[PDB]
Amino acid sequence: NKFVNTMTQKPTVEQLIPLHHWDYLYEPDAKSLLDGLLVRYVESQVYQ
Amino acid sequence: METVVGLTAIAVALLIGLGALGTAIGFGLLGGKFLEGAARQPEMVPMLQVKMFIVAGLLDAVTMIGVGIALFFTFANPFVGQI
Numbered sequence: 001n002k003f004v005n006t007m008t009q010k011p012t013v014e015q016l017i018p019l020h021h022w023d024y025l026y027e028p029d030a031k032s033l034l035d036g037l038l039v040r041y042v043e044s045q046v047y048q
Numbered sequence: 049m050e051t052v053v054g055l056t057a058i059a060v061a062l063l064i065g066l067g068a069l070g071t072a073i074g075f076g077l078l079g080g081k082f083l084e085g086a087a088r089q090p091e092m093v094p095m096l097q098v099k100m101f102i103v104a105g106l107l108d109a110v111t112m113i114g115v116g117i118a119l120f121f122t123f124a125n126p127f128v129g130q131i
Contacts, residue, residue: 022090 063118067111
C-alpha cells in the first residue's frame with residue numbers, strides 16, 4: 001500500500017526489475033561496481 | 049683534413065638526430081596525458097594547457113643546446129682550427 005494521505009492508503013504494484021557531460025574514475029572496474037550498485041538499489045526500494 | 053670535416057658532418061647528424069628522436073617521443077608521452085586530462089576535466093583544459101608549457105621548456109632544455117651546437121659546428125667548425 002502507498003501512503004497517499006492520513007485518510008487514503010492506495011494499493012499499488014510497480015516493477016522493480018527491469019528498471020551528465022563529464023565521466024567518473026572507476027575503482028576497481030566499472031562492471032564490478034555496477035553489479036554492486038544494482039543490488040543496493042533493489043534492496044533499498046524494498047525497504048522503502 | 050677531410051676526416052675531421054667528414055666526421056663533423058656525422059657529429060652534427062647525431063646532435064640534432066638524437067634530439068629529434070627524444071623530443072618527438074617525449075611530446076607523445078606528455079601530450080597523450082594532456083588530451084586525457086582534457087577529456088576527464090573539459091572545463092579545466094585552460095589550466096592543464098598552461099601547466100603543460102612549464103614541462104615543455106624543461107623537455108626542450110638540453111635538446112635546444114644540441115641544436116645550437118649543431119649549427120655552430122656547420123658554419124664555424126671549432127675542430128678545423130686545431131691543425
